[PDB]
Amino acid sequence: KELSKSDRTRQFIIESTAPVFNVKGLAGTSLTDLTEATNLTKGSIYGNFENKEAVAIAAFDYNWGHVKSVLTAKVQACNTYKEMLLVYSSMYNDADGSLFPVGGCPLLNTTIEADDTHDALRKKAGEAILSWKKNLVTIIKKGIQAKEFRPDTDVTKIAFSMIALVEGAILIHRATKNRAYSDYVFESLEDLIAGIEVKK
Amino acid sequence: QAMKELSKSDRTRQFIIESTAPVFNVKGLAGTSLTDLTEATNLTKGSIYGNFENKEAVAIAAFDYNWGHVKSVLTAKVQACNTYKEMLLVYSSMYNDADGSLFPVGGCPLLNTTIEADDTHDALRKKAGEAILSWKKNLVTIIKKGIQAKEFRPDTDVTKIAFSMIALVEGAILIHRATKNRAYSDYVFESLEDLIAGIEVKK
């Protein structure tokens, strides 16, 4: 069925403001940033969202939804389970980061801001991490059954360790502006997965 | 007036840094307002800005104090170890013991500063980069000693291991901060141990 004018207006607000939220955060994103990005008035914007926090939550869902849809495309184009676990380097590094939203990883960006300021957004970050981990568990356990990976693999440890490596690699890149440094971490992620493979 | 001149001093400056560093670490430079600062210090705007040029100068000093604190803890824990391996694995106890009370309020300033500053604030991004690279250099120094003490193998890719450790520690913190559950971050610290076990000389 068809989107209403309200649905389309909210969608436009989110699309226009999500890159600002991802770079400036909830605290650094002003009313003027919102109105300038949309050419809508305060009253129009807040006739579509309850408050700024509500806009920020939707921006997170959008930004993280975007990373997820890229990740899904890449995973679905893989021919082995191992390759599904190693799409991250190309996702982050290709096109100088242009496959990610402007401002980088929204899970990283949001957690750091919301963790001690904004429980509802902290909860979404938490749920995003745990859903990613769950997807990784599923891929790993399919790789075990396909005999790509060893049956005694500690699946949970590997899944969380993957997340830690990818996000830590991104941190190092954003702190240093040098992809060579983060490339070492993405190399360690491949070492991590190679270490679970059955002997060739 | 008279009060601005009189409240300019190294001790007042240090008190300002100490009082406001937990607020910057939690709220960030953009989220920290003047009334946050005057409430945290119980001092007037005049006393604060008689010791610092502007809020940004206060944020920079806060970062140096916050990270200097993490550095000092890591230094103290490393100097209590018997083995090079142990020195590489003090991170879990530093972040998890006494419910995180050894870390600054708000968690890791390097993580917290980088996410804010990376696309908004050159000076502070540069500080975070220098921090990460100094931490990396220290780790390399420890690993190389471990190699010459025959604790770790000579074929070890020291730079690769040093950056991966950093990733694992910061990634562990991130997961803990997002989920509020130390059991999840404990899996990452477990992989930090596995990384270092994997560079040990053959048994």
XYZ file of C-alpha atoms in Angstrom, chain A residues 1-196:
196
model
C 0.000 0.000 0.000
C 0.886 3.692 -0.452
C 2.919 5.981 1.843
C 0.920 8.972 3.089
C 2.194 12.577 2.854
C 3.151 12.242 6.582
C 5.212 9.092 5.934
C 6.996 10.744 3.004
C 7.631 13.914 4.988
C 9.088 12.016 7.950
C 11.209 9.987 5.512
C 12.526 13.197 3.903
C 13.334 14.707 7.308
C 15.284 11.584 8.280
C 17.146 11.339 4.986
C 18.104 15.021 5.124
C 19.176 15.127 8.780
C 20.706 11.633 9.374
C 24.137 12.655 8.018
C 24.198 15.602 10.432
C 23.270 13.453 13.406
C 25.965 10.940 12.411
C 28.706 13.627 12.411
C 27.509 16.130 15.062
C 25.538 13.867 17.357
C 22.304 14.661 19.111
C 24.030 17.379 21.255
C 25.828 19.081 18.409
C 22.885 19.049 15.966
C 20.983 22.318 16.306
C 17.470 23.409 15.261
C 19.173 25.510 12.610
C 20.993 22.452 11.274
C 17.611 20.700 11.036
C 15.758 23.576 9.289
C 18.662 24.265 6.957
C 18.982 20.652 5.974
C 15.242 20.312 5.211
C 13.979 23.795 4.310
C 11.097 22.941 6.632
C 10.093 25.048 9.629
C 10.464 23.981 13.251
C 6.681 23.565 13.367
C 6.614 21.381 10.307
C 9.437 19.167 11.613
C 7.909 18.819 15.053
C 4.478 18.289 13.571
C 6.094 15.082 12.239
C 8.291 14.119 15.245
C 7.614 14.544 18.955
C 11.029 16.045 19.780
C 14.694 16.155 18.705
C 15.481 12.905 20.463
C 12.766 11.208 18.315
C 14.450 12.577 15.167
C 17.812 11.255 16.391
C 16.392 7.786 17.026
C 14.944 7.601 13.546
C 18.230 8.880 12.103
C 20.071 6.031 13.898
C 17.586 3.454 12.525
C 18.107 4.889 9.081
C 21.937 5.145 9.232
C 22.324 1.671 10.753
C 19.677 0.327 8.314
C 21.879 1.592 5.524
C 24.978 -0.243 6.849
C 22.853 -3.355 7.292
C 21.537 -3.250 3.681
C 25.099 -2.876 2.302
C 26.247 -5.768 4.548
C 23.358 -7.920 3.331
C 24.158 -7.242 -0.353
C 27.781 -8.166 0.181
C 27.058 -11.278 2.268
C 24.545 -12.501 -0.301
C 27.130 -12.211 -3.080
C 29.516 -14.568 -1.216
C 30.194 -18.160 -2.302
C 31.429 -19.458 1.031
C 30.571 -18.811 4.660
C 34.152 -17.727 5.316
C 33.824 -14.952 2.765
C 30.581 -13.784 4.434
C 32.528 -13.152 7.638
C 35.218 -11.133 5.777
C 33.224 -8.545 3.788
C 33.948 -5.822 6.375
C 37.257 -4.449 5.094
C 35.896 -3.785 1.590
C 32.684 -2.336 3.116
C 34.569 0.200 5.240
C 37.532 0.916 3.023
C 36.169 0.896 -0.539
C 35.538 4.326 -2.073
C 37.203 6.026 0.876
C 34.252 5.118 3.182
C 31.460 6.134 0.759
C 29.589 2.892 1.311
C 29.035 3.946 4.959
C 26.888 6.962 5.864
C 28.674 10.316 6.123
C 30.426 10.411 9.577
C 31.179 6.650 9.683
C 29.716 3.849 11.747
C 26.515 4.933 13.409
C 26.698 2.094 15.946
C 30.056 3.368 17.148
C 28.984 7.040 16.970
C 25.716 6.490 18.764
C 27.008 4.246 21.531
C 29.671 6.756 22.570
C 27.159 9.585 22.762
C 24.152 7.771 24.196
C 25.828 5.339 26.577
C 25.819 7.854 29.502
C 23.259 10.398 28.211
C 20.245 8.756 26.444
C 18.873 5.423 27.522
C 16.410 4.911 24.694
C 19.165 5.350 22.087
C 21.667 3.302 24.158
C 19.062 0.493 24.007
C 18.863 0.669 20.216
C 22.670 0.519 20.010
C 22.594 -2.528 22.299
C 19.932 -4.204 20.218
C 21.884 -3.415 16.978
C 25.042 -5.047 18.386
C 23.163 -8.125 19.602
C 21.338 -8.529 16.254
C 24.600 -8.313 14.363
C 26.122 -10.898 16.778
C 23.122 -13.161 16.182
C 23.593 -12.932 12.402
C 27.261 -13.802 12.824
C 26.306 -16.859 15.024
C 23.995 -18.039 12.245
C 26.725 -17.755 9.568
C 29.339 -19.405 11.749
C 27.025 -22.361 12.574
C 26.200 -22.812 8.847
C 29.956 -22.892 8.159
C 30.426 -25.587 10.827
C 27.710 -27.753 9.201
C 29.206 -27.193 5.759
C 32.556 -28.348 7.205
C 34.196 -24.973 6.540
C 34.658 -24.395 10.250
C 35.640 -26.675 13.161
C 32.776 -28.164 15.222
C 34.360 -27.075 18.510
C 34.425 -23.371 17.475
C 33.462 -21.072 20.396
C 30.855 -19.318 18.235
C 29.879 -16.624 20.666
C 33.423 -15.654 21.433
C 34.284 -15.415 17.751
C 31.142 -13.371 16.907
C 31.748 -10.794 19.610
C 35.478 -10.757 18.757
C 34.628 -10.015 15.096
C 32.481 -7.051 16.137
C 35.254 -5.803 18.401
C 37.853 -6.033 15.645
C 35.731 -4.294 13.022
C 34.662 -1.483 15.328
C 38.181 -1.164 16.782
C 39.628 -1.018 13.281
C 37.204 1.830 12.450
C 38.220 3.664 15.659
C 41.898 3.436 14.796
C 41.210 4.741 11.269
C 39.142 7.655 12.507
C 41.652 8.618 15.234
C 44.700 8.434 12.889
C 43.266 9.120 9.393
C 45.606 6.363 8.187
C 44.115 3.236 6.597
C 47.445 1.388 6.925
C 46.932 1.114 10.673
C 43.381 -0.149 10.469
C 44.446 -2.531 7.702
C 46.449 -4.484 10.298
C 43.301 -5.007 12.308
C 41.343 -6.227 9.275
C 44.280 -8.600 8.698
C 43.842 -9.868 12.278
C 40.116 -10.413 11.563
C 41.055 -12.679 8.672
C 43.572 -14.460 10.999
C 40.718 -14.946 13.500
C 38.471 -16.646 10.903
C 41.319 -18.696 9.343
C 41.989 -20.028 12.826
C 38.490 -21.555 13.009
